[PDB]
């Protein structure tokens, strides 16, 4: 059997290359900026025209009573992900302020 002869320490070694730095892409052109602005604008109009959904109302009500941990549990069960819940709570909080 030609397997499992080296230790983990010696398997971790590596050859000394010379690396190339990554080309950063930070510049964003004028036309790309206007494009992003118009999309964010459109998102405002929808919220203005049609308002909040039932679970969003129930959520925001709990935030007024400082029921932070109840709101957390509630949102987790509605959206599934604990990450989506943490994000949606932060967006709702900012809307109320």
């Amino acid at each position: 059997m030609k397997i499992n002869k080296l230790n983990n320490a010696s398997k971790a070694l590596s050859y000394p290359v010379k690396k190339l730095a990554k080309t950063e892409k930070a510049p964003l052109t004028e036309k790309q900026q206007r494009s992003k602005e118009l999309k964010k604008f459109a998102m405002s109009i929808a919220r203005e025209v049609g308002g909040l959904a039932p679970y969003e109302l129930r959520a925001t009500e709990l935030l007024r009573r400082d029921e932070d941990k109840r709101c957390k549990k509630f949102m987790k069960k509605r959206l599934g992900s604990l990450k989506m819940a943490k994000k949606k709570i932060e967006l709702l909080a900012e809307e109320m302020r």
Partner: protein, 203 residues
């Protein structure tokens, strides 16, 4: 532009305006016959993502499907076999409910090709869909440069062979280790490649 505003409103399905419109439209769809022709698309943005234009030789039809799982077709629950294969209820279909809509529209509109389909509503009993159809024997279409491909003879009855957006999803196709069951083209293509004995000349 205009199509962006429509997208954002169509996504808010529990806004007051969308609850209003879903209620009134689902009432009307159920008073009509089970497959009927529409005047135009209900949602302009969605139909245009999927390839609709308002030119001669394209149409929208609308279809309804009954909801829930589909029971085993046996009398009195008698299956004549082993007990692990005796269940009748809680058996779920392999294809989406959408796939049934596409298959039935294609039978009725036999002179035309099924392009794509989308959701338009639900209630306690039915689910409702719009199907985009094209006519390959039409001078306008034969000379188009974007949908002229549908006239190739291989494009007959795409829906029956699991090739449309609604019918494709039950096949299990994809890229990576999570889809090893379909390496080769399909489940049956993988089966053949795995259950064959190769007998070379010199051996």
């Amino acid at each position: 532009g205009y199509l962006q505003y429509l997208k954002e409103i169509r996504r808010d399905k529990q806004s007051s305006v969308m609850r209003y419109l879903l209620r009134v439209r689902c009432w009307e769809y159920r008073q009509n016959t089970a497959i009927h022709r529409a005047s135009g698309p209900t949602y302009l943005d969605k139909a245009r993502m999927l390839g609709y234009r308002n030119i001669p030789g394209m149409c929208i039809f609308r279809a309804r499907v009954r909801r829930g799982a589909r029971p085993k077709k046996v009398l009195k629950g008698n299956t004549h076999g082993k007990p692990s294969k005796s269940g009748v209820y809680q058996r779920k279909p392999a294809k989406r409910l959408q796939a049934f809509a596409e298959i039935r529209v294609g039978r009725k509109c036999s002179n035309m090709r099924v392009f794509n389909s989308y959701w338009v509503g639900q209630d306690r009993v039915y689910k409702y869909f719009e199907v985009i159809m094209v006519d390959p024997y039409c001078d306008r279409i034969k000379n188009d440069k974007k949908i002229n491909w549908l006239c190739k003879p291989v494009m007959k009855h795409r829906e029956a062979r699991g090739l449309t957006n609604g019918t494709k999803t039950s096949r299990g196709l994809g890229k990576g280790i999570r889809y090893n069951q379909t390496k080769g083209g399909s489940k049956r293509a993988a089966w053949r490649n795995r259950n064959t004995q190769s007998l070379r000349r010199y051996r």
